[PDB]
Amino acid sequence: HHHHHSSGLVPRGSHMISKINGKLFADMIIQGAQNLSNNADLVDSLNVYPVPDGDTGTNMNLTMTSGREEVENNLSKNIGELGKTFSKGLLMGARGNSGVILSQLFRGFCKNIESESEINSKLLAESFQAGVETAYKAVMKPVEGTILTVAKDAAQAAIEKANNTEDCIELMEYIIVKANESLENTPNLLAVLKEVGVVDSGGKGLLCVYEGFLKALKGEKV
Numbered sequence: 001h002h003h004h005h006s007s008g009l010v011p012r013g014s015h016m017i018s019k020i021n022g023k024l025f026a027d028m029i030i031q032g033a034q035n036l037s038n039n040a041d042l043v044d045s046l047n048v049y050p051v052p053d054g055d056t057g058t059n060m061n062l063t064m065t066s067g068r069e070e071v072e073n074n075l076s077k078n079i080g081e082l083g084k085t086f087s088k089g090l091l092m093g094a095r096g097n098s099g100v101i102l103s104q105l106f107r108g109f110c111k112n113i114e115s116e117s118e119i120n121s122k123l124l125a126e127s128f129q130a131g132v133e134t135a136y137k138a139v140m141k142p143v144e145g146t147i148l149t150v151a152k153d154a155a156q157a158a159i160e161k162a163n164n165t166e167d168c169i170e171l172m173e174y175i176i177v178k179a180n181e182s183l184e185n186t187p188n189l190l191a192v193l194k195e196v197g198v199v200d201s202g203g204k205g206l207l208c209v210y211e212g213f214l215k216a217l218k219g220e221k222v
């Protein structure tokens, strides 16, 4: 077997997050929104599906900004309450296919935590999963190779990793790795992406939000 551990010492270190309260979630939202805003022109230029109308980044940015502004004006330590504020802002500001889907992903995420004051890594993962289920149900004819695919693959990664990972920083790092793998695979699912030579614009915007989430978990700003 192993050495039977009985030391009274508690491990040292401070660069881990085991609980996410409403203010940390707000910081995630704010940095995710800022990172998306900084990448909006690129995300627009990648847009080819359904139509190459140059707007995915703008659409997602405006949607996320509506959520961010509600959050900044109504902060709370209670993550469930903060999520209600964020969800409302997204849902009253959603634009484009991408912004509608984004608002539905986060509607499901936030509903899953509505009665919590803080969440751990397992509940974070479960909430990404809940968001994916809400978004697929909201789209009448889901297509693979899109923001839905990337969100789905990210949530599957989250559930697998959280089962043995208490640290939300490590969890979010892994989610981003796997979301990026999914995003790079989108042209293998959706023909126009491969023909033009781009990844999915909605999925890229979602990865920008997730990368801001990670920055906030580390106590950093975009």
Ligand SMILES: Nc1ncnc2c1ncn2[C@@H]1O[C@H](COP(=O)(O)OP(=O)(O)O)[C@@H](O)[C@H]1O
Binding pocket: 047, 049, 050, 051, 053, 054, 055, 056, 057, 059, 060, 095, 096, 097, 098, 099, 101, 139, 141, 142, 143, 144, 145, 146, 147, 148, 200, 201, 202, 203
């Ligand atoms: N049926 C669908 N299933 C999954 N994702 C979709 C669908 N339709 C659009 N999208 C997502 O939206 C992105 C384009 O967003 P956007 O430019 O806002 O669209 P639009 O200009 O058509 O409203 C795509 O990259 C894709 O991920």
Ligand SMILES: [Mg+2]
Binding pocket: 053, 055, 096
């Ligand atoms: Mg459009």
Ligand SMILES: [Mg+2]
Binding pocket: 047, 049, 050, 051, 052, 053, 054, 055, 056, 096
């Ligand atoms: Mg478009």
Ligand SMILES: [Mg+2]
Binding pocket: 015, 169, 170
């Ligand atoms: Mg670490």
Ligand SMILES: [Mg+2]
Binding pocket: 181, 184, 185
């Ligand atoms: Mg690949």
